[PDB]
Design an enzyme around this catalytic site. Structure first.
Site, PDB file in Angstrom:
ATOM      1  N   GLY A 100     -98.102 -22.354  61.608  1.00  9.04           N
ATOM      2  CA  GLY A 100     -98.581 -22.858  60.338  1.00  9.04           C
ATOM      3  C   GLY A 100    -100.000 -22.473  59.965  1.00  9.04           C
ATOM      4  O   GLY A 100    -100.744 -21.888  60.759  1.00  9.04           O
ATOM      5  N   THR A 101    -100.353 -22.815  58.726  1.00  9.42           N
ATOM      6  CA  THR A 101    -101.675 -22.580  58.163  1.00  9.42           C
ATOM      7  C   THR A 101    -102.724 -23.163  59.098  1.00  9.42           C
ATOM      8  O   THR A 101    -102.435 -24.071  59.871  1.00  9.42           O
ATOM      9  CB  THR A 101    -101.793 -23.274  56.796  1.00  9.42           C
ATOM     10  OG1 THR A 101    -101.275 -22.418  55.769  1.00  9.42           O
ATOM     11  CG2 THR A 101    -103.229 -23.645  56.508  1.00  9.42           C
ATOM     12  N   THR A 102    -103.946 -22.648  59.038  1.00  8.50           N
ATOM     13  CA  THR A 102    -104.992 -23.178  59.902  1.00  8.50           C
ATOM     14  C   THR A 102    -105.709 -24.340  59.194  1.00  8.50           C
ATOM     15  O   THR A 102    -105.842 -24.342  57.967  1.00  8.50           O
ATOM     16  CB  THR A 102    -105.995 -22.054  60.317  1.00  8.50           C
ATOM     17  OG1 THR A 102    -107.050 -22.612  61.109  1.00  8.50           O
ATOM     18  CG2 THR A 102    -106.581 -21.387  59.110  1.00  8.50           C
TER      19      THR A 102
ATOM     20  N   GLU B 234    -106.696 -24.218  55.117  1.00  6.31           N
ATOM     21  CA  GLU B 234    -106.341 -22.965  54.471  1.00  6.31           C
ATOM     22  C   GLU B 234    -105.085 -23.182  53.634  1.00  6.31           C
ATOM     23  O   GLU B 234    -104.130 -23.788  54.094  1.00  6.31           O
ATOM     24  CB  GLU B 234    -106.076 -21.898  55.542  1.00  6.31           C
ATOM     25  CG  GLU B 234    -105.401 -20.636  55.028  1.00  6.31           C
ATOM     26  CD  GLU B 234    -105.017 -19.663  56.138  1.00  6.31           C
ATOM     27  OE1 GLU B 234    -104.497 -18.574  55.815  1.00  6.31           O
ATOM     28  OE2 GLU B 234    -105.225 -19.978  57.328  1.00  6.31           O
TER      29      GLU B 234
ATOM     30  N   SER C 162    -101.168 -29.051  60.322  1.00  3.02           N
ATOM     31  CA  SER C 162    -100.619 -27.704  60.281  1.00  3.02           C
ATOM     32  C   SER C 162     -99.229 -27.757  60.904  1.00  3.02           C
ATOM     33  O   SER C 162     -99.040 -28.380  61.950  1.00  3.02           O
ATOM     34  CB  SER C 162    -101.505 -26.752  61.097  1.00  3.02           C
ATOM     35  OG  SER C 162    -102.876 -26.868  60.734  1.00  3.02           O
TER      36      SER C 162
END
Lengths: 243, 244, 244, 242, 198, 241, 250, 233
Positions: free
Chosen positions: C30-32, C47, C75
């Protein structure tokens, strides 16, 4: 057939693998702990390891205050350890409410052991991968150490150790008592009992400790508390002025 | 999920047979043999105690013959513990009936209720069936002496003479060979012992390995009497019939 | 044997719970997102990959508030994240209702902890597919936390999770070393914007959107608030400037 | 094993798809809608000459203005019919009017996906999907004569004409060419009789086939054998005519 | 209340039940049969609360018939009355108790003896030579205490009842519109259609 | 608690548990029913895997649901009891609320519904039973004969048979039963029934029971002799050729 | 959540065996030996206190438990399973008997209750059988002294004397040699010690052996006086000292 | 691999995937195309209705949830009925209890959570349908995209279903243009029909084949079908 290894039913050898694998998890934290009984106190020592620099060292512990009088140190993954701690607190609070007196260390241990036995017999509940060491200065029994495992087993100890290097610590303690011939550290102050504890932890593990490598919990008449980095440093200093 | 560990104890085989029932029956076939023989003046129940020891207390023991009523008793072949669960509910059903109608329960009604309980574990619930077969010996004022049999499937039937447990095939052939409609309780007692005597997987047939019961209507009275023989009593009837 | 990884609460021969471990994979994919503890509060940044120009900018908010003093960002599987926050909200409301005082961060952490750990106890549920960073200010200071799919959590000085957790952690460690005295809410907001930018290299392929929130005793009065307008751009620039 | 409400890698529900296969093995059912009413016909398909064919009920009344024909595991259709009858009668009690044909159909379809071993959405207590498809025909003031095809999937389509059962692919092709916006009720009748005759293994007669219709004027009616016998004779004649 | 009477003679049990059904100021019906046949040889009469009365009678009838079919046997009069008593005894402690009193007259084909059971809504059961529910008992028990005899024939029993009905038609405040009489014996249950002047 | 879906669809569109339920029926003793012009006859065969039974008490194959309707079956005996009890209860309930006994179709439709329900409810297997239900509707003289099966499907028959070798005996009936002229007598109806059973019972005077059902709750079971007499007259029709 | 394991975990295999019960018995086989001997005026049950560590206090672990003042139990197999069974047994003696008849249950009936609990873990959904075999000794007015064995299946049987666990086969053989229907309690205690010695590897003394008896009433263990009909419990655990005194006369 | 981890929604694959959810997503892709786009005054839904036979109807794909909200579906119709019905109730609750029209953003959160529950529990199945939600609330025109995974996103425009990719690239291109079609509905609709036809291939949008729905500033969510859409073909 091969599922006699996923849930808690017997294997052709009358074994419960899930319980054995749960025992394996208890060492996942690679930490060792030990407990000893003083003349009128009970001390539990546990290595404290904080690898990540981004962590707040003050929030990393495996010692818990279950009640004003009972302390519990856990050997195993933190989530199951906290699951066990919350339950023990609720159980200790309920006992006092219903029966009018503080739940004894051994009774709480039996109770948690029974709860564990159940996860061992009912298929929908998994055992908790932890070993619980309970301590206190019971009003009837005096200094007490009772430990429970994923099998639902439990017993009282003169002293005990738990973790990857449990055996080395155990034999060290065993030798000391074969020598002293008594079943406890014949010291009047808990500070000295804590020093005995740490001293033998070092001898057995062949390692030196700073004030942030340990974690100490102490039990006395009517109270169980944990030491601060500074209370420990003072302990480490004392033992240093002997060697 | 759980589905993974479900044995599905209540399904049909491609041949239309119920696995668990068939396997429970297989289990029963290794149980001590129990025999039931109905005569004109009574009924005989005899059973062989599977496995015994010098130290086993036979005076306080009972693993095969149970009293359900003062007019009904059963012989068990299978898991004792399972049998006890069923026996107890049978005893309660008999008392409910008595309380409702103020009459003892007719033998078949009770047998049917028990058989129905068994039938259930066969169609729903996902639980294993009871590994038990019963031989019911009872008496009521509508059919007099009666002998029934029920097994894991919940099916039941009436008999003049029947056996359950181990070597029933051999036992049945012997019974079908010497049984006679006009027999008498004492004739039956002897027939029962002889049959067990020839089917036993043991050396000899001693009293410490038997349980005996009879349901007679003691001529000197007019009522029905159940008699679960005591150790000594079995030892006696054993010598008399010529088995010593 | 094998198959120890097909059911959630099963211990593998080495004492692990493989399903939890697979949950982690969903998190690392996943996104940070990060969190930075300052001298009187905490900052949260994340993010937000711009899948396309069609995404209305600034509209799909990810950071969530609990009660009025707690921030949560995660995340992994977003829906699982929302689920966990909903629980946290019910959990906080319950605590306030009985004790009057809004829930302390440590206490709150355990509520999420226990709930998450609970989802590793049965095979009828799946573990959570998110690592959650959350915290706020309370009766005695600021607190930052990170909770893993196993239910494990600890207090942090700084924390990161998601695709670029390594970059982030590297940056966070520098800050920790170069500021033993403590960063300020104002500083943390910028520093957070930078780390998100740096850590965006592990996904430099897709364009993104920055999102920050904070809770500072002095800057927000102890209430969780989102960083918007001028303070936001000023942080965006501070990053864009040090990204070169 | 595998859940009764599992998705295949193609995004389909196994149980529903397999359900459709059972419906393929069913007797043929055909419905045709015209501005003069809707005709519903079915292949009795008795399995032995000793079976009293008239005890085969594959065309049932839902309400005076709604009829129904089934195909597949017909025993599975009883609770559906019961639900429909109750919904139609109930609606009339609550609103002093007739239930719209679409509404009735939508209600029947709401039962469809209510199966599973504990699906998180309500209390779907039904171990499997239905193994029968239904043709629901009727009339209402707002949308006139209508024909719907209700499947175990829960989806229902409206058709000018439709065929379900073993001979559906074949019969549907026929209906494609034969149907036109101005068919008369009589034409529709012969048309249903004709196509059934083509797909049926047995030689169609008034005993192994049955017709019915729903008209705004007289509602749903199941043609008695004598009435259909004549329609059959009339068909044989028009066919032999060229 | 309604008149519900029963008398057990030598080889039969006779039940007499008033025909009136009155509500408030109006006698709505004068040909009401306050009885239900539970089995070919068992009859039950009843009086009490407006709707409970028949609902209970029919519920009991349904159960006895079910037992008969299941067992292809006819329960004895004593068995049926014990079943009825238990039902009433459960009811008295329920949310809304059945407020019904009954008389069960049956001929026990196994014992070859008629039997009369009187049971009130509380589940109070007693077996008697003669019985009654309501105010009727207040004039008939002493009348029968005087004129009744064990060995009486069915015909003598009917004359004995006639003596009862006449007393009731003389001293009772209400017009119960006569009674319907039924005999239960070894041959079943039959209704004496001629009591309007026997 | 237990609600596992036991009866589910397979790729070919079959529900194997219902299918296997039928296999349990094929294995059951044969049962047949033929309707005359003024009656319906039900015949069943008697197994002989074990013989030494007490015929008096051993549960019979034809069961009365009410005084005017009977039910016979082929399949699991234990299962049949459950269906019979529910039928008997529904019969009494129907008399209680409709103030009229059940018609044979109604009673059939009820039993069938119970069977169907057990084919799509969690935690239960279908009934391994098929039934033949016959009798006369209240105040009606037109004979009724219906058949139900595990799936829940039901229909009426001029004559039908179920159970082991029902294939054989059905053939017999299909080429021995004329709808134009149904057995105009209780006697010739019982004869056609015995003949059909002999095609499979293989000489069994004690292995063939029969029950005759006439209008207005007139139901009676023939004794060994009465039946044995029909067998006798039957074996002569053969030898006299 | 919610236990969705509503089906049996013990089912019949094609051979007719009940796997889980068989396996439970195998667990009992690996367990420490325990035995029981019935005398004319008492019963003795004993076992070895196999301490799992010299640091453990073997006294805080009792393998021999009092169920009622006249009934005791000992076991072989899984200790934790036993512990919960004892809790349930002590309670069923109250709920299903003392609270109804105002007196403790006779040995056979309490045994019957325990056996029932064990049979259910053999058929109920979601559970495994108990991995233990118990030896229950007791006394009651109308039945006198008795000794029972309860196995994982729920089956139970009365014994004159017997042994379960590790070296049960050998121990039983040894008991058959020394047992007779005239043994006095002290004689049985003695034979019990001899039998137990053959099963113990290391130290054999009052601190490694756990032994209790069901004998005469112990008014001194009642806790009060003033009620003639109340004479005290018949169940008594021997002290470490009491055991050693008898070992010297071994 | 996969085959061992796609048996139910309560199982993670070795890489952290949920195949049952992914298979459900596949039902959408197999679904007919639908498009959504909004300006600052309106939001429009254009959907291609699919038919079984030439004798059958073209299944509706637009459901009105309230006077100010509605959606278009792609995939399992019944699941859309369920979800839209839940949405109708949530809109209803908001009005009855708070006399407040439900914010599209909130409607999206509610849907996300309802779908998420069928992806973490045993026994259930993920929903097999995608939804495009449009509405005008106290903050203007809105368009949301709902995926069975529980993911809901707010966009200026988008499309789902078979060949949806065509229409989507078109909108991502036409962005600066339609986003300004304020005060003119007919233009926004036409811009929608143009985006949708970018996914055609089989046939061409006919009268009883095209379905359009609009909502805005002073336009209650209304659906146009047949003759009503003729002027747009």
């Amino acid at each position: 057939a091969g599922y006699d290894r996923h849930i808690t039913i017997f294997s052709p050898e009358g074994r419960l693998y899930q319980v054995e694998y749960a025992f394996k998890a208890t060492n996942q934290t690679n930490i060792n702990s030990l407990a000893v009984r003083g003349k009128d106190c009970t001390v539990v020592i546990s290595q404290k390891k904080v690898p990540d620099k981004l962590l707040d060292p003050t929030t990393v512990s495996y010692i818990f205050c279950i009640s004003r009088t009972i302390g519990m140190v856990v050997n195993g993954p933190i989530p199951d350890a906290r699951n066990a701690a919350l339950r023990a607190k609720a159980e200790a609070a309920e006992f006092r409410y219903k029966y009018g007196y503080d739940m004894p260390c051994d009774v709480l241990a039996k109770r948690m052991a029974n709860l564990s036995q159940i996860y061992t017999q009912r298929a929908y509940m998994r055992p908790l991968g932890v070993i619980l060491t309970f301590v206190s200065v019971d009003e009837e029994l005096g200094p007490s150490i009772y430990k429970t495992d994923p099998a639902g087993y439990y017993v009282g100890y003169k002293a005990t150790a738990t973790g990857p290097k449990q055996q080395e610590i155990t034999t060290n303690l065993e030798n000391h008592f074969k020598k002293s011939k008594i079943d406890h550290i014949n010291e009047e102050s808990w500070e000295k009992v804590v020093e005995f504890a740490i001293t033998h932890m070092i001898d057995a593990l062949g390692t030196e400790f700073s004030k942030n490598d340990l974690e100490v919990g102490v039990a006395t008449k009517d109270k169980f508390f944990t030491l601060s980095a500074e209370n420990i440093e003072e302990r480490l200093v004392a033992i240093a002025e002997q060697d | 999920g759980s589905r993974r560990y479900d044995s599905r104890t209540t399904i049909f085989s491609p041949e239309g047979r119920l696995y668990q029932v068939e396997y429970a029956l297989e289990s029963i076939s290794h149980a001590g043999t129990a025999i039931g023989i109905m005569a004109s003046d009574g009924i005989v129940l005899a059973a062989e105690r599977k496995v015994t020891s010098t130290l086993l207390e036979q005076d306080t023991s009972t693993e095969k013959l149970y009293k359900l009523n003062d007019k009904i008793a059963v012989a068990v072949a299978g898991l004792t513990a399972d049998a006890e669960i069923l026996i107890n509910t049978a005893r309660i059903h008999a008392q409910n009936y008595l309380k409702t109608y103020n009459e003892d329960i007719p033998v078949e009604i009770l047998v049917r209720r028990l058989s129905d309980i068994k039938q259930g574990y066969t169609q729903h619930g996902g639980l294993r069936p009871f590994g038990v077969s019963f031989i019911y010996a009872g008496y009521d004022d509508r059919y007099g002496y009666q002998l029934y049999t029920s097994n894991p499937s919940g099916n039941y039937t009436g008999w003049k003479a029947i056996s359950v447990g181990a070597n029933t095939s051999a036992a049945q052939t012997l019974l079908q060979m010497d049984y006679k409609d006009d027999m008498k309780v004492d004739d039956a007692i002897e027939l029962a012992l002889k049959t067990l005597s020839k089917t036993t997987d043991s050396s000899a047939l001693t009293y410490d390995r038997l349980e005996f019961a009879t349901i007679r209507k003691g001529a000197n009275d007019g009522e029905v009497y159940q008699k679960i023989f005591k150790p000594q009593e079995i030892k006696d009837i054993l010598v008399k019939t010529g088995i010593t | 044997g094998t198959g120890y990884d097909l059911s959630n609460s099963v211990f593998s021969p080495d004492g692990r719970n493989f399903q939890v471990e697979y949950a982690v994979k969903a998190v690392e994919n996943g996104t940070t997102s990060i969190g930075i503890k300052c001298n009187d509060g905490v900052v949260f940044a994340v993010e937000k990959l711009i899948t396309s120009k069609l995404l209305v900018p600034q509209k799909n908010v990810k950071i969530q508030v609990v009660d009025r003093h707690i921030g949560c960002v995660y995340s992994g599987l977003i829906p699982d994240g929302r689920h966990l926050v909903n629980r946290g909200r019910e959990e906080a409301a319950s605590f306030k209702k009985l004790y009057k005082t809004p829930i302390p961060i440590p206490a709150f952490a355990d509520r999420l902890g226990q709930y998450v750990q609970a989802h590793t106890l049965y095979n009828s549920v799946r573990p959570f597919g998110v690592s959650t960073i959350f915290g706020g200010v309370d009766k005695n200071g600021a607190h930052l936390y990170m909770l893993e799919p196993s239910g494990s959590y600890w207090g942090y000085k700084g924390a990161a999770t998601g695709k670029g957790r390594q970059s982030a952690k590297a940056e966070l460690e520098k800050l920790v070393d170069h500021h033993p005295e403590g960063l300020s809410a104002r500083e943390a907001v910028k520093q957070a914007a930078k780390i998100i930018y740096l850590a965006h290299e592990d996904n430099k392929e897709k364009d993104f959107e920055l999102e920050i929130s904070w809770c500072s005793l002095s800057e927000t009065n102890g209430l969780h608030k989102f960083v918007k307008g001028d303070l936001l751009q000023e942080a965006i620039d501070f990053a864009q400037k040090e990204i070169n | 094993d595998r859940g009764v409400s599992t998705f295949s890698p193609e995004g389909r529900l196994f149980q529903v798809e397999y359900s459709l296969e059972a419906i393929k093995l069913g007797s043929t059912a055909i419905g045709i809608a015209t501005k003069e009413g809707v005709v519903l016909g079915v292949e009795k398909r008795a399995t032995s000459p000793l079976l009293e064919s008239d005890s085969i009920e594959k065309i049932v009344e839902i309400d005076r203005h709604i009829g129904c024909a089934m195909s597949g595991l017909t025993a599975d259709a009883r609770s559906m019919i019961e639900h429909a009858r109750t919904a139609a009668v109930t609606h009339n009690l609550y609103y002093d009017e007739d239930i719209n044909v679409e509404s009735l159909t939508q209600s029947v379809c709401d039962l469809a996906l209510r199966f599973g071993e504990g699906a998180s959405g309500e209390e779907r207590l039904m171990s499997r999907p239905f193994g029968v498809a239904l043709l629901i025909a009727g009339h209402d003031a707002d949308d006139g004569y209508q024909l719907f095809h209700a499947e175990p999937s829960g989806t229902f389509y409206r058709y000018n004409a439709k065929a379900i059962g073993s001979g559906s692919e074949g019969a549907q092709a026929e209906l494609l060419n034969e149907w036109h916006s101005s068919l008369t009720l009589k034409e529709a009748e012969l048309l249903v009789l004709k196509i059934l005759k083509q797909v049926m293994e047995e030689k169609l007669d008034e005993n192994n086939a049955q017709l019915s219709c729903i008209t705004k004027q007289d509602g749903f009616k199941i043609y008695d054998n004598e009435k259909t016998a004549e329609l059959i004779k009339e068909l044989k004649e028009k066919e032999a005519a060229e | 209340m309604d008149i519900i009477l029963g008398i057990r003679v030598q080889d039969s049990v006779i039940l007499a039940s008033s025909k009136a059904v009155t509500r408030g100021i109006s006698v709505l019906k004068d040909s009401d049969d306050k009885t239900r046949q539970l089995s070919p040889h068992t009859l039950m009469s009843f009086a009490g609360e407006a709707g409970d009365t028949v609902q209970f009678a029919e519920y009991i009838q349904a159960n006895i018939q079910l037992y008969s079919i299941r067992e292809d046997y006819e329960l004895s009069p004593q068995a049926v009355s014990s079943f009825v008593r238990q039902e009433l005894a459960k009811s008295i402690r329920s949310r809304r108790p059945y407020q019904v009193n009954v008389l069960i007259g049956g001929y026990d084909k196994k014992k070859n003896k008629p039997e009369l059971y009187q049971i009130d809504y509380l589940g109070t059961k007693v077996e008697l030579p003669y019985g009654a529910h309501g105010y009727s008992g207040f004039y008939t028990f002493s009348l029968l205490d005087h004129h009744y005899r064990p060995d009486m024939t069915t015909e003598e029993g009917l004359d004995l009842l006639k003596l009862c009905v006449q007393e009731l038609e003389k001293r009772m405040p209400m017009d119960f519109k006569g009674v319907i009489v039924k005999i239960v014996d070894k041959d079943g249950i039959r209704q004496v259609d001629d009591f309007q002047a026997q | 608690g237990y609600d596992r879906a036991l009866s589910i669809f397979s790729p070919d569109g079959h529900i194997f548990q219902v299918e296997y339920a039928l296999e349990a029926v094929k294995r059951g003793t044969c049962a047949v029913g033929v309707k005359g012009k003024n009656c319906v006859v039900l015949g069943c065969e008697r197994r002989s895997t074990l013989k030494l039974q007490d015929t008096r008490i051993t549960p019979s194959k034809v069961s009365k649901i009410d005084s005017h309707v009977v039910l016979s079956f082929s399949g699991l005996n234990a299962d049949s009891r459950i269906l019979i009890e529910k039928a008997r209860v529904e019969a009494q309930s129907h008399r209680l609320t409709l103030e009229d006994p059940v018609t044979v179709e109604y009673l059939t439709r009820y039993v069938a519904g119970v069977q169907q329900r057990y084919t799509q409810s969690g935690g239960v297997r279908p009934f391994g039973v098929s039934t033949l239900i016959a009798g006369f509707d209240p105040r009606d003289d037109e004979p009724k004969l219906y058949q139900t099966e595990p799936s829940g499907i039901y229909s009426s028959w001029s004559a039908q048979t179920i159970g082991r070798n029902s294939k054989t005996v059905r053939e017999f009936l299909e080429k021995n039963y004329d709808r134009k002229e149904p057995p105009a007598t209780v006697e010739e109806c019982v004869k056609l029934t015995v003949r059909s059973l002999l095609e499979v019972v293989q000489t069994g005077a004690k292995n063939i029971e029969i029950t005759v059902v006439k209008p207005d709750s007139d139901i009676v079971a023939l004794s060994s002799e009465e039946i044995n007499q029909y067998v006798t007259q039957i074996e002569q029709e053969k030898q006299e050729q | 959540m919610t236990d969705r394991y509503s089906f049996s975990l013990t089912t019949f295999s094609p051979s007719g065996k009940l796997g889980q019960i068989d396996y439970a018995l195998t667990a009992v086989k690996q367990g420490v030996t325990s035995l029981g001997i019935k005398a004319t005026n008492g019963v003795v049950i004993a076992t070895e206190k196999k301490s799992s560590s010299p640091l453990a206090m073997s006294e805080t672990l009792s393998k021999v438990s009092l169920l009622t003042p006249d009934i005791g139990a000992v076991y072989s197999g899984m200790g934790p399973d036993y512990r919960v069974l004892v809790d349930k047994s002590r309670k069923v003696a109250h709920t299903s008997y003392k609270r109804i008849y105002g007196e403790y249950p006779p040995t056979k009936l309490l045994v019957s209750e325990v056996a029932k609990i064990m049979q259910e873990a053999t058929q109920s959904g979601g559970v495994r059988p108990f991995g233990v075999s118990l030896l229950i000794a007791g006394h009651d007015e109308f039945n006198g002294f008795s000794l029972y064995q309860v196995d994982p299946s729920g089956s139970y049987f009365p014994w004159k004397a017997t042994a379960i666990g590790k070296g049960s086969v050998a121990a039983k053989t040894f008991l058959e040699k020394r047992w007779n229907d005239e043994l006095e309690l002290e004689d049985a205690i003695h034979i019990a010690l001899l039998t137990l010695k053959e099963s113990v590897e290391g130290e054999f003394n009052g601190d490694t052996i756990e032994l209790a008896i069901i004998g005469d009433e112990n008014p001194d263990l009642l806790g009060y006086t003033g009620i003639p009909t109340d004479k005290g419990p018949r169940f008594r655990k021997l002290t470490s000292q009491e055991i050693n005194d008898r070992l010297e006369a071994l | 691999f996969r085959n061992n981890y796609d048996g139910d929604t309560v199982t993670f694959s070795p890489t952290g995937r949920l195949f049952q959810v992914e298979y459900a997503l596949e039902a959408i892709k197999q679904g007919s195309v639908t498009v959504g786009l909004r300006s600052n005054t309106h939001a429009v839904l254009v959907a291609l209705k699919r038919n079984a036979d030439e004798l059958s109807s073209y299944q509706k794909k637009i459901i009105k949830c309230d006077e100010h909200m509605g959606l278009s579906l792609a995939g399992l119709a019944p699941d859309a009925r369920v979800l839209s019905n839940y949405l109708r109730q949530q809109c209803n609750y908001s009005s009855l209890v708070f006399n407040r029209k439900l914010a599209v953003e909130r409607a999206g959160h509610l849907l996300c959570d309802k779908a998420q529950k069928n992806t973490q529990s045993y026994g259930g199945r993920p929903y097999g349908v995608g939804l495009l939600i449009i509405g005008y609330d106290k903050s203007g025109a809105h368009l949301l995209e709902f995926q069975p995974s529980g993911n809901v996103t707010e966009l200026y425009g988008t499309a789902i279903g078979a060949r949806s990719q065509g229409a989507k690239t078109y909108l991502e291109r036409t962005l600066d243009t339609f986003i300004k079609i304020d005060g003119n509905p007919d233009e926004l609709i036409k811009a929608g029909v143009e985006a949708i036809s970018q996914s055609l291939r089989d046939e061409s949008l006919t009268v009883d084949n095209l379905s359009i729905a609009i909502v805005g500033k002073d336009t209650p969510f209304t659906i146009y079908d047949g003759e009503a859409v003729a002027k747009y073909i």
